Amino acid sequence: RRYRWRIQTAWDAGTVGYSLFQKFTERVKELTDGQLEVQPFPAGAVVGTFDMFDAVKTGVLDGMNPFTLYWAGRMPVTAFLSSYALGLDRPDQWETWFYSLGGLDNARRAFAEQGLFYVGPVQHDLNTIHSRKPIRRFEDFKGVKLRVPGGMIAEVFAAAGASTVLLPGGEVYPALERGVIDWSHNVYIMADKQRNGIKANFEIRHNIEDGGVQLAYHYQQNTPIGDGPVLLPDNHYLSTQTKLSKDPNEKRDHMVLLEFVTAAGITLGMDKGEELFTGVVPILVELDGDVNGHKFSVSGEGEGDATSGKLTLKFICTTGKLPVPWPTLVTTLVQCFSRYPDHMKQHDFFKSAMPEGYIQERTIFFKDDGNYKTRAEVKFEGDTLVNRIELKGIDFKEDGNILGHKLEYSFNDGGAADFVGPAVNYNLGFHQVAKYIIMGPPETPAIHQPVDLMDFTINLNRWRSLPKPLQERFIAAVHEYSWIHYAGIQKANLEAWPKYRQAGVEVIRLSNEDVRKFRRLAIPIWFKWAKMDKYSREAFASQLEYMKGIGYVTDEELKGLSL
Ligand SMILES: [Ca+2]
């Protein structure tokens, strides 16, 4: 009669990808005269993304539109049915390998053993890396917390020193906001009723220039200066992205600072001084400091825009050379500029205390070293928001990372994520939570996933129930959609790159030498996955022959590796 197939895709609703997938279901009805209908489902609507394989195998779903290498843990061949690092890197090469060099039937025999019919690949895009750490060379990957899709992709970055996690794309945004895993620099804000203010305790990790890390434990309390009513918040956190730079025309010891601050951590829809921040507000900071008796003064000026959460400031040490590293002063040197979403406005203590302002006190303990004690008044002086600070430091090793100036000029939480290409990652908001894009050099712009293929895979019993004329038409339909989908994604990507620059994202290009370093790690990983079983061996053997044929692999660089 009429055949109806439920098919869930890896694409989340509200991506370019899902819109294209939805149009595919209409094309299939057209091409089959209404006889085959595909009911489309966005990611998660029927089962979790990574649960699609078992759902289709058992028939809960009739089919799926996944990224094929998601099955790498249970079907090694699938790590070879989508690009892997520094291998074949053009869409046309993967088309050739699939449709004339044996790939399609290699995939179909492997999936038939699982009760699945692999229809064909779906072309898509390269992938980008979105990072909160400025990763400018190979060695900067060490200690990064990186989301990736498992398999060989994760193994390559793990071998370069990264910690890897596996998450679906629709969960990447909140993960990047919280450090991806293990630790972050988020400040949980808690009401302090007895001081009619707030308190917070958090831990900053300062990178040591030669490796590894210097911990700075922060204790914080805030109390209003005046007696007007303030807002006492429910639990929530502030997440800050900070960029530190230098002014090339400034000769005093200084720090140029750019920050983006968002309040979060309250779920939407659960059962006066704010007006002063509706536009751009000038800022002045003054700090008078004394660390082990080394005296100094810092002045800063700039502005903040709480509607955006953006701060722009320049700081100068006016007494000469700063005796401590500038990154150790970032937390001391105006949380009233945080961007609070509409549904969280009632939790903004910092703006509620203005204009008379608030006192901010901290103790900051550097592990195995001295401590800072800081006290600050933050308030309006006229129309300028001012932060005046006294800082006193004691018990520091002149030997140490602080007085020895051994800390990297940086301030970030080490989180980064690959997912897909720039347009869909923009659909998911990555530009808001990561201000760097890490790409390869112009010779090798995509190091880990240059050809990130989807597919259609159908429950094998459902497939065999379909009359053969509709089978062939569905195969044709998928092959046509592979390139319609590709073309749609590529068009959106053209629109997305300018939007990244407007959001303040910087594109960082690694070097050819960085690529060579990845390549010496990638080739052994190819052979290890290839040897897992007979399907992965067959697919890599034919890909390796092809790569040798077009000059992508030399025999010398294998250094003895063979199947
Ligand atoms: Ca990816």
Numbering used by the authors: 11 to 281, 295 to 356, 360 to 589
What does the paper say about this structure?
To enable investigations of the emerging roles of intercellular shuttling of l-lactate, we now report an intensiometric green fluorescent genetically encoded biosensor for extracellular l-lactate. To construct a prototype l-lactate biosensor, we inserted circularly permuted green fluorescent protein (cpGFP) into Thermus thermophilis TTHA0766 l-lactate binding periplasmic protein at 70 different positions. To develop variants of eLACCO0.1 with larger ΔF/F, we performed two rounds of linker optimization, followed by seven rounds of directed evolution by random mutagenesis of the whole gene, with screening for l-lactate-dependent change in fluorescence intensity. This effort ultimately produced the direct response variant eLACCO1 with ΔF/F of 6 and a strict requirement for Ca2+ at concentrations greater than 0.6 μM.
In an effort to obtain molecular insight into the structure and mechanism of eLACCO1, we determined the crystal structure of eLACCO1 in the l-lactate-bound state at a resolution of 2.25 Å. The overall structure reveals that the cpGFP-derived and TTHA0766-derived domains are closely associated via an extensive interaction surface that contains numerous molecular contacts. The TTHA0766-derived domain of eLACCO1 retains the same dimeric structure as TTHA0766 itself. Trp509 in the dimer interface forms a hydrophobic interaction with its symmetry-related self via π-π stacking. Mutagenesis of this residue abrogated l-lactate-dependent fluorescence presumably due to disruption of the dimeric structure, providing support for the conclusion that eLACCO1 functions as a dimer. The structure of eLACCO1, which we assume to be representative of eLACCO1.1, reveals that the imidazole side chain of His195 is likely a key moiety for mediating changes in the chromophore protonation state. The eLACCO1 crystal structure reveals that Arg142 forms a salt bridge with Asp439 in the l-lactate-bound state. This salt-bridge may further limit residual interaction of Asp439 with the chromophore (possibly due to increased distance or more effective charge neutralization) and thereby contribute to increased brightness of the l-lactate-bound state and a higher ΔF/F. To decrease the affinity for l-lactate, we introduced the structure-guided Tyr80Phe mutation to remove a hydrogen bond between l-lactate and eLACCO1. This produced the low-affinity eLACCO1.1 variant with apparent Kd of 3.9 mM.
